[PDB]
């Protein structure tokens, strides 16, 4: 049928893998990372911490077809440095990043248990 | 035919407000005062009730 | 099998190969009785 | 090439709003939090109906659509249930559903309203949200209606009725200190609500080397979730879908060799 499950936009598939590594051949130190059943919430957040590293040259996401679910993702560093390690290094700083604010919100939340004023 | 439970812009609950809203109106309370009293604010939710149509009080009338 | 009036609403049998007429009330409209085994539907 | 160091500061609390702001964070963490309030957030709702007898005026599958929209109060015991898809017992069981009933008959001649006061289930953790009453049908005499219904759990993306929030509202720069948006003619722009500029301005002056902070904040709710557990729900969220590609990533460069 044309109509499509709900569930299709984010239920992997058995053979299906989440991520996929390919290296770029034009230009040296380049990777193509290929996230699947993902969308913007999860591309736009990766892609504003890669830049705020020093030894990245190039990020960019783009979402092929809003209709499929699948994102893309190209990352270039200089030559001392890693596509795959400034990858795995951006997303260890947003988790300090998200139990940080969590701390800090649960505590002002008890911070009227009673109330302040 | 009868109110939505959800307001189809925000999803703010506006079901079960229907009733009230004939009462308010009842006691004179003018409409713009009614739908302030009922809370309702932004013009989207505001829609739903100025602009609702009754019709199952009129299905009502033929004998099952 | 079972056949609802058109007016009264009383249920009345009517056997296969036979006139179509109410009882009690003599009408000549009749509705079918609501299946008996179930069906699911989705919220969705 | 590391984190920052937010700072949350709330201002308003009450059982159906909360108001705060967020400091000293990027644009685009600031609004992944927004998509998250909405879409996936995990709350009970129902998703299996099946009708015994219905001689009401309204079709069946009117009736089975006005049910699933009713919010349930899933404050605590969302945790404690699996995905009906993952659980290893058969169709439904108590470990993933909860079941309700219904049953109403009209006999007086006067007309009935057939409210959410009726939805009988058996975990006393989850009911409708009443501790007025929403309506789902009117009643002659003579008719009447019954059913047998369960509700599963899932978030938003599956389906608009697994959402917890009415509006959000967020907005950042109450004055165009940056310019990110031009008005043609600044002063017909109602000043906005957050603004400190004086009454005889129209916007702040530009400069050029500035970057978006301090977010604004407002999560309603529809009755399920607290306003303040939608907040912890959602950051606890995220961050379980982020160390979960991580797993999968290391997973590939490892099995690279
Ligand atoms: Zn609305
Ligand atoms: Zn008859
Ligand atoms: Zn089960």
Not at chain 3, 27 to 38: E, G, N, P, Q
Request: aromatic share 8%; charged share 30%; proline share 6%.
């Amino acid at each position: 049928m044309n109509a499509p499950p709900a569930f299709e936009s984010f239920l992997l598939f058995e053979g299906e893998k989440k991520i996929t590594i390919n290296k770029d051949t034009k230009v040296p130190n380049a990777c193509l990372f290929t996230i699947n059943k993902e969308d913007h919430t999860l591309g736009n957040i990766i892609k504003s911490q890669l830049l705020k590293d020093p030894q990245v040259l190039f990020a960019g996401y783009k979402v092929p077809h809003p209709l499929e679910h699948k994102i893309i993702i190209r990352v270039q560093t200089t030559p001392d440095y890693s596509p795959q390690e400034a990858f795995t290094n951006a997303i260890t700083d947003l988790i300090s990043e998200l139990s940080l604010l969590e701390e800090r919100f649960r505590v002002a939340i008890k911070d009227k248990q009673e109330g302040i004023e | 035919m009868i109110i939505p439970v959800r307001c189809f812009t925000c999803g703010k609950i506006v079901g079960n407000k229907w009733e009230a809203y004939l009462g308010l109106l009842q006691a004179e309370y003018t409409e713009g005062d009614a739908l302030d009293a009922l809370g309702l604010k932004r013009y989207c939710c505001r829609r739903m009730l100025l602009a609702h149509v009754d019709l199952i009080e009129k299905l009502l009338n033929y004998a099952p | 099998m079972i056949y609802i009036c058109g007016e009264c609403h009383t249920e009345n049998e009517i056997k296969s190969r036979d006139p179509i007429r109410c009882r009690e009330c003599g009408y000549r409209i009749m509705y079918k009785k609501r299946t008996k085994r179930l069906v699911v539907f989705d919220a969705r | 090439p590391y984190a920052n160091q937010p700072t949350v500061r709330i201002t308003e609390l009450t059982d159906e709003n909360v108001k705060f702001i967020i400091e000293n964070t990027d644009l685009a963490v600031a609004n992944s939090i927004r998509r998250v309030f909405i879409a996936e957030v995990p709350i009970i709702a129902i998703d299996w109906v099946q009708i015994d007898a219905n001689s009401s005026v309204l079709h069946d599958e009117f009736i089975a659509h006005r049910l699933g929209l009713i919010p349930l109060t899933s404050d605590d015991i969302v945790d404690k249930l699996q995905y009906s898809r993952d659980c290893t017992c058969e169709e439904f069981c108590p470990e993933c559903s909860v079941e309700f009933t219904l049953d109403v008959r009209c006999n007086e001649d006067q007309t009935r309203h057939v409210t959410s006061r009726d939805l009988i289930s058996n975990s006393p953790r989850v009911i409708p949200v009443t501790s007025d009453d929403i309506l789902i049908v009117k009643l002659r005499k003579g008719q009447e209606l019954r059913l047998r219904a369960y509700a599963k759990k899932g978030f938003g993306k599956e389906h608009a009725k697994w959402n917890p929030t009415a509006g959000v509202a967020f907005e950042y720069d109450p004055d165009n200190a940056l310019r990110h948006t031009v008005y043609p003619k600044p002063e017909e722009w109602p000043k906005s609500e957050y603004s400190e500029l004086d009454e005889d301005e129209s916007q702040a002056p530009y400069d050029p080397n500035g970057k978006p902070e301090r977010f604004y904040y407002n999560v309603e709710s529809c009755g399920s979730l607290r306003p303040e557990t939608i907040v912890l729900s959602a950051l606890s969220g995220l961050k379980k879908k982020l160390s979960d590609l991580q797993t999968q990533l290391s997973h590939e460069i490892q099995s690279d060799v």
